[PDB]
UniProtKB/Swiss-Prot annotation:
<feature type="modified residue" description="Phosphoserine">
    <location>
        <position position="3"/>
    </location>
</feature>
<dbReference type="InterPro" id="IPR002335">
    <property type="entry name" value="Myoglobin"/>
</dbReference>
<dbReference type="GO" id="GO:0019825">
    <property type="term" value="F:oxygen binding"/>
</dbReference>
<feature type="binding site" description="proximal binding residue">
    <location>
        <position position="93"/>
    </location>
    <ligand>
        <name>heme b</name>
    </ligand>
</feature>
<feature type="binding site">
    <location>
        <position position="64"/>
    </location>
    <ligand>
        <name>O2</name>
    </ligand>
</feature>
<keyword id="KW-0561">Oxygen transport</keyword>
<dbReference type="GO" id="GO:0046872">
    <property type="term" value="F:metal ion binding"/>
</dbReference>
<keyword id="KW-0514">Muscle protein</keyword>
<keyword id="KW-0597">Phosphoprotein</keyword>
<protein>
    <recommendedName>
        <fullName>Myoglobin</fullName>
        <ecNumber>1.7.-.-</ecNumber>
        <ecNumber>1.11.1.-</ecNumber>
    </recommendedName>
</protein>
<dbReference type="GO" id="GO:0098809">
    <property type="term" value="F:nitrite reductase activity"/>
</dbReference>
<dbReference type="GO" id="GO:0016528">
    <property type="term" value="C:sarcoplasm"/>
</dbReference>
<keyword id="KW-0349">Heme</keyword>
<dbReference type="GO" id="GO:0004601">
    <property type="term" value="F:peroxidase activity"/>
</dbReference>
<comment type="similarity">
    <text>Belongs to the globin family.</text>
</comment>
<keyword id="KW-0813">Transport</keyword>
<keyword id="KW-0963">Cytoplasm</keyword>
Length: 152
């Protein structure tokens, strides 16, 4: 649960992502895959990528980065009222993609990392705190649906 002050910070930070959604999306996925190579194995269409150069040169990775961040952004803009938006994602990720919640933790931290990297000195403590809380909320609501499904 975030205050309106914190949501305002979240959506302000998100304005940065939206000025270049593909670049941000790409770098988030690269940070995930290089930081936690086991995550790469969940994507049959990215598992072929072995090097970060190949990742960087992949237009399809950028495209998926756009899909992922577009979805997260739509969820963030709901300011916590995202049951309708989140439920199909939780279901697809638990039942089809089989993504354990740990990996959602991974990508959460990766987003924080990328924002600092692309906006050094421009991602303040208050903004990081708000964004972190937002991603925790997201994760926690997914986790609840995972439990429902008995998914580990
Ligand atoms: C902020 C977190 C995430 C968001 C917003 C998100 C969103 C999405 C969306 C919208 C899709 C396409 C629709 C669907 O299949 O449901 C998708 C597909 C997929 N996602 Fe996620 N995702 C997230 C995190 C992750 C993570 C951390 C992993 C794995 C480590 C992952 C693995 C996959 C896979 C394997 C697909 C199918 C890709 C394909 O074959 O086209 N997702 N995701």
């Amino acid at each position: 649960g975030l205050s309106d002050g914190e949501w305002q910070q979240v959506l302000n930070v998100w304005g940065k992502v939206e000025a270049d959604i593909a670049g941000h999306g790409q770098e988030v996925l690269i940070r995930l895959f290089t930081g936690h190579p086991e995550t790469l194995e969940k994507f049959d269409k990215f598992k072929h990528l072995k090097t970060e150069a190949e990742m960087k040169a992949s237009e399809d990775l950028k495209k998926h980065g756009t899909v992922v961040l577009t979805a997260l952004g739509g969820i963030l803009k709901k300011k916590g009222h995202h049951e309708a938006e989140l439920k199909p994602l939780a279901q697809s990720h638990a039942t089809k993609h089989k993504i354990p919640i740990k990996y959602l933790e991974f990508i959460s931290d990766a987003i924080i990392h990328v924002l600092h990297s692309k906006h050094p000195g421009d991602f303040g403590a208050d903004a990081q705190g708000a964004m972190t809380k937002a991603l925790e909320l997201f994760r926690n609501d997914i986790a609840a649906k995972y439990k429902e499904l008995g998914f580990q």
